[PDB]
Symmetry: D2
């Protein structure tokens, strides 16, 4: 009811989907129907693919610096529209407006800006072989890539995916999460408004098992970039391979550990833990959900942790004093509660939370209290499985080598962090943790220069950093022979 019927975006104009069916998107703070959104058919994906192939031809035909200037124009618009877009992100995801105004559009435009200035620097190699022959390589675009986004950081994930694709000369077909489609459509307007060729950034909406699947199966799409669940990511990746042998980037979940060593400043460690567990209402791909505290500091540490949680300002995501909103949708809230119920059932001593917040207007919303369990064993479900909700698990260890072994005893490897004041230990311990994103005495910072990605089953490939731009290009090796040819026939 709140917004006009959202249509598909193909070729710089809005288009009509050829399906006749729609789905709704819902405000989690109250339950509003935000908009009826059209779902794409197999015919609409085929249209976006054809629109992207021809649009990419124009984008790639430009100079490195033209694309650089156009993308930089898109940065300028994103900054001028920060407040407008940040509010729209809060309507759809339920994230505090204090967070979306400073983080989502801010750091999403940050990465677009970083690559925008690196486009002219994309280069190939040159190797001499002998007086008569040398090889040189080219870095050409892949062509049409497609990105599938998650719902916790809709606008940023779109930028973190599309920024390097466009910097490298590709067109991207973006499918926003079925939960949060509004914001990605506004980014398509902005890319077109900045001068990006028609077709280079199309947006397809609809159910994940259908339109997302069809994008991954398509014979002309050259790469799939996916953010989401590890379990879903496997089904996605196997499909992208078996269909046409596409290159893939996977940013999946993780049960990331945070080790607090004895010489750590406990006040800093408690600030770290709560930031790593309860920011965005605990709905971050890289949250440090397994906090390893040394037995000797266990009691003092929970004292500091409960003190922070109790002053967490939960409330309406539209209110500026709110730093803790609802969960993304009523279905997801229920599973987070199921895990919370599972932690109680296996006798993991609750400390706070464990309730759905219902008093006053919070019954109209999908509110879950900041929840911390303690005295957890390694075999409990809340220690083994990714909850993707505001649930901190405090584990107790005895030796340094035990905490590193346990941090590693997970099928996940997205993030890890140590907190310590010793030079030797900080570096020695971070080297032993099997994770791609490692923090020392901090948590949650991802600058655009720093490649971020998962070990093991938390991901394949990387995002951000220099390395990521390279993986949106293909190496072509050209050997130039200047001398005579030796045939054995």
């Amino acid at each position: 009811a709140r917004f006009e019927e959202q249509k598909l975006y193909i070729g710089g104009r809005y288009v009509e989907a050829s399906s006749g069916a729609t789905f709704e998107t819902i405000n989690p703070a109250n339950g509003e129907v935000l908009a009826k959104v059209q779902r794409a058919s197999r015919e609409d994906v085929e249209r976006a693919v054809q629109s992207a192939v021809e649009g990419q031809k124009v984008w790639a035909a430009m100079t490195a610096m033209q694309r650089s200037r156009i993308l930089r124009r898109a940065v300028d618009i994103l900054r001028e529209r920060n407040d407008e877009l940040a509010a729209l992100e809060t309507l759809d995801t339920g994230k505090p407006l204090a967070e979306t105004r400073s983080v989502d559009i801010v750091t999403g435009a940050d990465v677009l800006e970083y690559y925008a200035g690196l486009v002219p620097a994309i280069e190939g190699e040159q190797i001499p072989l002998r007086e008569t022959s040398f090889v040189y390589t080219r870095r050409e675009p892949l062509g049409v890539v497609a990105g599938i986004g998650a719902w916790n950081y809709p606008v940023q994930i779109a930028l973190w995916k599309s920024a390097p694709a466009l910097a490298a000369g590709n067109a991207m077909i973006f499918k926003p999460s079925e939960v949060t489609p509004l914001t990605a459509l506004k980014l398509a307007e902005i890319y077109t408004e900045a001068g990006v060729p028609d077709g280079v950034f199309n947006v397809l909406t609809g159910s994940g098992r259908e339109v997302g699947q069809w994008l991954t199966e398509h014979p002309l799409i050259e790469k799939i970039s996916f953010t989401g669940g590890t379990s879903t990511g496997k089904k996605v990746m196997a499909s992208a391979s078996s269909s046409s042998l596409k290159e893939v980037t996977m940013e999946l979940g993780g049960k990331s550990p945070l080790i607090i060593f004895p010489d750590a400043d406990l006040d800093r460690a408690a600030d770290i833990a709560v930031m790593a567990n309860f920011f965005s209402s605990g709905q971050v791909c890289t949250n440090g959900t397994r906090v390893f505290i040394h037995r000797s500091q266990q009691a003092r540490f929970e004292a500091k942790v409960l003190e922070r949680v109790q002053r967490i300002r939960l409330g309406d995501p539209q209110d500026e004093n709110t730093n803790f909103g609802p969960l993304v949708s009523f279905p997801h809230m229920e599973s987070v509660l199921g895990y919370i119920e599972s932690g109680k059932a296996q006798k993991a001593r609750l400390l706070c939370g464990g309730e759905r917040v219902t008093d006053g207007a919070f019954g109209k919303g999908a509110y879950v209290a900041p929840t911390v369990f303690t005295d957890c064993r390694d075999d409990m479900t809340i220690v083994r499985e990714e909850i993707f909700g505001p649930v901190m698990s405090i584990l107790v260890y005895d030796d340094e080598d035990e905490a590193i072994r346990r941090a590693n005893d997970t099928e996940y490897g997205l993030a890890a962090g140590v907190v310590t004041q010793d030079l030797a230990r900080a570096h020695r311990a971070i080297h032993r943790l099997e994770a791609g994103i490692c923090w020392i005495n901090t948590w949650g910072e991802s600058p655009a220069e720093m490649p971020v990605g998962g070990y093991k089953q938390s991901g394949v490939g990387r995002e951000n950093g220099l390395t990521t731009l390279a993986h949106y290009t293909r190496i072509k090796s050209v050997q130039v022979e200047l001398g005579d040819y030796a045939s054995v026939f």
Copy 2:
């Protein structure tokens, strides 16, 4: 048979597989049984994995310069044993002895030598963020990788895969093709003799559908490197994704084009055409099986090709005077012969060859004469599909933009080549070809410095060159915060 029963290689020695199964490997030139080879069981795969996990711990713990010395010592051994192994490769694949003595072991040891000197150079980045924080990356080994090799260049493929894998600090479990398992076991002997830690290169032999599959499903293996056909490569990758989300390198087949431009010296163009079609008896993934001649030179070019083909010395691969051996096996010959029937049947003009050679002692072997088809259209099966046998398809074009457009009208993209004398055309045309390996006035050369891999459905990832060594490491980003930690809680 000709050799003792080849056992499994795990932990620095030969071991007995516990499976109870064996298989024969056959010389295609005469039909003699070369050896009985043991097949790995699921327990043996587990044993090799446990050996690699442990052996990799030792290897990564050495200093980069010690590993470099160890790999270089193996190079000296490979040069010491060139003629021995080349002979072994000729019994196992049937390739002429003039080829295996100069190509298979030489260029395999060429690549190992290259990476042997690059180990001390593997480095990570360091990025300043602010006076109070910096990030640095580590290039950690993936751990235990697995390689699955093809049968056309057994020892060469094993070397191109194990060299960067071992140079990066990994342990690799190698599965040679069930067709040609002998040479890879000698490679395990050589690495151990040079000082490689026990377990860093184990070799399991056996079926692709069982032991090869069990490897790609294994949870403790971190990457799969595969060489073979595209239809098989899709299933292999889908298995590695769906199982544990492994990293992959795919070296698949292709129907690579060779465009001969009107200004080409047709004598060089004809030597290039045959070298790209009949070396290794047409069993090279990167063979340029679609030859583009301009109509004005078609007649004279066919003359030049036909004159050269008639000289080809088909005969016993044990004779050093033979330059054209049998195919790898009789089943494969039936398939290559099946395609020839399609070219005769689809009204394509057979120019020479086109039959199986049975004259004299050649009936005991899998011999197909070099076959040239001409007046081929794009709708014919022999133009659209990888034959992997000595079959040349000569296509006629009228202008440049047709020939480049047609060369690209394929789902394959492994190699391509132009033959021309004009500076502007050579560079302009080769830029427009959709292939990862481009040759100008030459063919089939892959220097170790030059990354090689396929576009489109011809591959994922690269081999050789600096970039490949990078893709046997994973990036870990460590952000060190030295200043204060902020918190919204």
Copy 3:
């Protein structure tokens, strides 16, 4: 004087110089006094050096993306004032308004734009040594750099020198040529309006023997970048080295060769030659002043050269129809005419020009007719020495290996060019030429990505390209030891 009396630029403002002396800058088109320019004192050098140290500390303190934005605003400002700044560049140099509106500020700002997006890309190395120790490198700013500019491309040289200097986090003290000081002062205004901290770009004006000398001898300045004559550059470098061991970059002169091979299209060969000899009225270091034509084509080539010269529109640099201005000054004119007189004296067959244009209103200016000599020997003065004027020398060669040999036979190595239609010849020939900037079938184009500098006595170090930005930082190696320290004492 046309303009108000020009002061020094130190600390974000114009200040009064403590010398008591001034000098005039003169319009070469008519003889008009453009401005009185202040001469810098020793106290003024000491004053600007203290300001650059204070400014660099502020500048290095910003985040890389802050520096990137500031520089990008200066790029946008420079695009807005292109025609205005181009007008000022034409009064000061006498170069046509058709050139300065197209080349001078355009390609100077191009380099600033290139480097502006690369600041977040400056990174250091990280090398693990063993589990117990690792090394990382930093790319720290050099500190306070100093630039001494030439007068042929006043505003462009300032940008090409200051763009990498500031992008790397350094402060620069720039001394423009005493002949062309006007534009350097406007750029200091532009950097300040764009947000550059006070002191990061100061401007000192005056004679090289005084102010330029004091800058190269000052102990707190860490690097000197000088563009100018080879004879002068040697004294500058010896002075900067002997004084405090500053690192240096030299862009010096050249007698650059242009080899036309027999199979070249002479129409392009003649178009290249005139552009390489008469652009900017012949006053470019990278001019092709030795043109090698094959004996067979000499007659045809001179004809094509004469035909092109005869349509050169010499005239008032303020006329847009003018594409060939006067020389930069009357003293320099006597020099260019002295060389012409020496070549007439040495029996070179003057083909056209060779005298000063004095007809009508051209008498007020230092106009020299485009001069081409032919039938030249290698020992003549016009062939051996750098003229820096509109004088083309046509030498006749007989085969390829001789022309490469003669072209290399010089103490210079700045630029060289071949013109040919053959793939093999172009690359083989350009590989044997001892010059740092090599063009094939073109001339005089310098993209920002391409490192440009001289071999031999034509220069030290490079400008533009990635490599230059690296050489405006100094490497610091930090080894962190995490284990025990062993001592033999």
Copy 4:
């Protein structure tokens, strides 16, 4: 003397110097004349340069892997003859035999081993411009470069200079120190024996004042690498530049600071201090001659240092237990004795040594006892200036930022080191120290992977690391124009 007349090594042979003069080299341990050494005349430098011109052409004409193998065999020869050369190094330098078998030849072949394996990794860039034009760079040898070595590490310095020089494809003319010429001549044999082309590594011996000067002035030499004192390095750099505008690498002196922070293990801080002052009898450019100890720890630290100094087993370098030899010559000894006598005069509280050892057989040698001064102010001569001897200066500081400010306050900047167990302190402190080699909780280890060189007046350029290999090539930029040429005339 003990050995026959040592001659010049030019063009693969020992040759007769055309000078008629000779000079002697003396064992500092006893005073025996080791050899009569010939001085090169001006005519011999021309012979060695012309030999190097021809020798390099053969060397650069080889493939990267051929050159790599030749250098790699030379490493092997050096490894076998390590203990032989270590014996020769002790006669000439007087350095303990416990040092020369472990450090001098080991770490010299270490760097040669590093670069020998990096030759195929030398690559250039390729940058596209438009469909019709691209730029590529080549990294070509400089040609004939020349090295001047210091006398403290004769074999090590010769290797660290020639290893990257040859790996890049250059020929070197090396002039050993007039003090220590012996080992440099045996290195020339070893290169030739490994297969180095004749002339690629020549050795001229003789006066610091004459032959070294004649090399830096020679017009066909393209680079000078000098290791030695800053006073001479300034004259060296000035002369090589003013003559023919050569590039230089300078490894000059330093008064390197060692900051011991309050939270440090004093025992490790003392092990570092003595090693950083007394290895090689204190004659290393990177010696930590300014030790900064905090006021509170001064007493305990002085004790731990003196406890260690008192057990230094000084003695005859031909002994296996001698770990402290004489100084390199009787002239150098008196200079070191001179600095001590002045430090006594400036009222610095001597702690130990302070005298020349003459008791018993040590009177025949140039033995100087390990000397430590304490309670030092910055005014003193022993604190500002390069002693190059076993003289440790202990400065007392009060708070952290002051010690950083004082340690930085020198015209030198080769090395610096902090000893602390705090993450933030260690890294923040090392970031503000202005030296090219920074050590944390260690000292004096210099791997081949880590570029080493000085800030400020301690050097120009780097040695070791990849970057050093890069700076023995010159970049040539090649722009290929495939489209039309646009001429404005």
